[PDB]
Design a protein around this ligand. Structure first.
Ligand SMILES: Nc1ncnc2c1ncn2[C@@H]1O[C@H](COP(=O)(O)OP(=O)(O)OP(=O)(O)O)[C@@H](O)[C@H]1O
Ligand SMILES: Nc1ncnc2c1ncn2[C@@H]1O[C@H](COP(=O)(O)OP(=O)(O)O)[C@@H](O)[C@H]1O
Lengths: 114, 325, 91
């Protein structure tokens, strides 16, 4: 019941990866995708870069964006962490844990309601 | 800097210049936690999160807007309780505040006049004097430090500064506190008449309507002889209603007090002959929230609150609701 | 600058009998969260140790028994660090 990094997952890592992509898509995020090197998939498929429109910015007409990278790790056989980190905020035109944490809550709700 | 009063006068100037030269940011630990609540949290849940985190207060977050949405303190409950007790012909109506989200409780408080229009905050990198002056103007006893993320327009709650942590910071850093050697009875400071007091037989709701009306954070409890026994603070209200039991508001101060955990800050006292040097020294080593001025017989004579002290050291000289507690 | 997509990869949407790679194992540094610390709670319980600079703005999470989400991240504010712990509904 203590604080732990990320969100806990179990089962199959490709099934978890699928669920993560489905949750990102329901939340409206955009994301990178696995590319197969020489026809074959690499474990870098478990590193996802995502871009999220910021609702409060979006409502006021702005193209400002939040960048979140996801990383699946095996903790032990059957148990995984989804690590989720902020890569920052950028407006189309040229620090804080918010809106990052408000976006993580969105992700978490999609993962939990799947 | 010649005799006592002249050495004190000098020392007080050094202390204000010091407050002005520091920022509010300077007061913070190098690394700390800040506990923030969504404004749409239910009232019951929020009281539960306060108890389990051993806090009495939390900043609110409107996450849709990415905006600071106010400060939840015990004054919120004290004010609505007092309103219901004064205006309601129905004693059980108070229970209804458990249907509320924090957003809905705040809207009841706006409606009754218990919340100002201009909500109070300072920039963390602005002078510490700004924080003191805002708290002095409003009668708020804590103040949020808010910056803005220019890339997103998102407000960044940095921390929430307390009168105690400011006085502690001063005690730790200004050597001049040791030169404040004028006895209290030769200063215009503190409150010495028309004190609001209670006894162990007093109803908690009458105390709580003392705290709102007088806008104080605590009421000293005396006996028939006026000897100081204990205190009933607005933070004690939390313990009475954390379980959902608003009929606990009908208890005597004595019965209520028997529920208090050993977590207690304590009841601090001084004499009219004591000085600010010794007081800043107690502040340095203890969570002192106020001092009751007593005589040899523990007879209550006055109150020196933290606000009293801060407002003395920062000035050149030269509604019926509780403010943020 | 990345190739962002809106659609779920199709090899993941297939009925599983495919021979896929494993994720990396958990690094030692993501095992301890600084919020679980309260070494100095007599003087000031908000005081935390200095964080690992590599774990800045990584999401942390806690179970509550209260029907709400507890989420946190650590960030640098000038030269100090703020770990904000946020309590938030699901709906
Ligand atoms: N029981 C009381 N009766 C009358 N006046 C009081 C009483 N307690 C405090 N006061 C005075 O009323 C004003 C409000 O006091 P208050 O207790 O709110 O100080 P404060 O800002 O809360 O600091 P602290 O938390 O140390 O009390 C102060 O000037 C104070 O000296
Ligand atoms: N919202 C909050 N988030 C994190 N820590 C808090 C919060 N409120 C209080 N604390 C911590 O709880 C302790 C006691 O706080 P409080 O009684 O509010 O202030 P003070 O001790 O300054 O009068 C302090 O260590 C403080 O930093």
């Amino acid at each position: 019941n203590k604080w732990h990094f990320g969100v806990r997952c179990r089962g199959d890592a490709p099934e978890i990866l699928l669920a993560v992509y489905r949750a990102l898509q329901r939340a409206g995020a955009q994301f990178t995708v696995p590319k197969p090197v020489n026809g074959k998939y690499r474990s870098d498929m478990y590193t996802i870069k995502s871009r999220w429109e910021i609702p409060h910015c979006k409502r006021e007409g702005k193209n400002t964006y939040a960048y979140i990278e996801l990383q699946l790790y095996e903790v032990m056989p059957g148990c995984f962490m989804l690590d989720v980190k902020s890569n920052g905020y950028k407006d189309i035109y040229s620090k804080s844990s918010f809106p990052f944490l408000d976006l993580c809550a969105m992700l978490v709700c999609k993962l939990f309601s799947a | 800097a010649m005799d006592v009063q002249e050495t004190q006068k000098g020392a007080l100037k050094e202390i204000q210049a010091f407050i002005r030269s520091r920022t509010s940011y300077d007061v913070l630990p190098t690394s700390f936690r800040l506990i923030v609540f969504d404004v749409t949290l239910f009232v019951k849940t929020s009281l539960s999160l306060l108890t389990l985190n051993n806090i009495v207060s939390a900043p609110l977050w409107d996450s849709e807007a990415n905006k600071f949405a106010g400060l939840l303190t015990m004054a919120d409950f004290v004010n609505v309780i007092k309103y219901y007790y004064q205006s309601s012909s129905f004693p059980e109506a108070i229970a209804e505040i458990d249907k509320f989200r924090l957003l809905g409780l705040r809207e009841v408080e706006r409606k009754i006049g218990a919340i100002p229009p201009e909500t109070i905050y300072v920039h963390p990198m602005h002078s510490l004097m700004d924080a003191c002056l805002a708290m002095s103007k409003s009668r708020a006893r804590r103040i949020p430090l808010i910056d803005v993320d220019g890339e997103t327009g998102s407000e960044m709650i940095v921390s929430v500064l307390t009168q105690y942590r400011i006085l502690k910071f001063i005690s730790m850093n200004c050597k001049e506190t040791a030169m404040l050697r004028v006895p209290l009875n030769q200063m215009t400071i503190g409150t010495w008449s028309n004190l609001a007091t209670a006894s162990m037989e007093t109803k908690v709701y009458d105390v709580i309507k003392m705290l709102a009306e007088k806008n104080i954070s605590a009421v000293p409890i005396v006996n028939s002889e006026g000897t100081l026994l204990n205190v009933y603070e607005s933070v004690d209200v939390m313990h009475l209603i954390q379980d959902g039991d608003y009929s606990n508001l009908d208890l005597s101060v004595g019965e209520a007090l028997l529920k208090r955990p050993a977590n207690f800050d304590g009841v601090h006292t001084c004499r009219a002959t004591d000085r600010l040097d010794g007081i800043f020294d107690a502040i340095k080593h203890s969570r002192v929230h106020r001092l009751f001025v007593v005589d040899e017989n523990l007879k209550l004579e006055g109150i020196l609150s933290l606000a009293d002290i801060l407002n003395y050291i920062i000035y050149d000289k030269t509604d019926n609701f509780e403010s943020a507690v | 600058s990345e190739q962002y997509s809106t659609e779920i990869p199709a090899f993941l949407t297939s009925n599983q009998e495919l021979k896929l790679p494993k994720p990396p194992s958990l690094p030692p540094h993501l095992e301890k969260c600084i919020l679980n610390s309260n070494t100095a709670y007599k003087e000031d319980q908000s005081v935390l140790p200095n964080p690992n600079h590599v774990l800045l703005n990584h999401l942390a999470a806690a179970n509550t028994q209260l029907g709400v989400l507890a989420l946190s991240a650590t960030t640098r504010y000038h030269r100090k660090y703020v770990t904000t712990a946020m309590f938030k509904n699901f709906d």
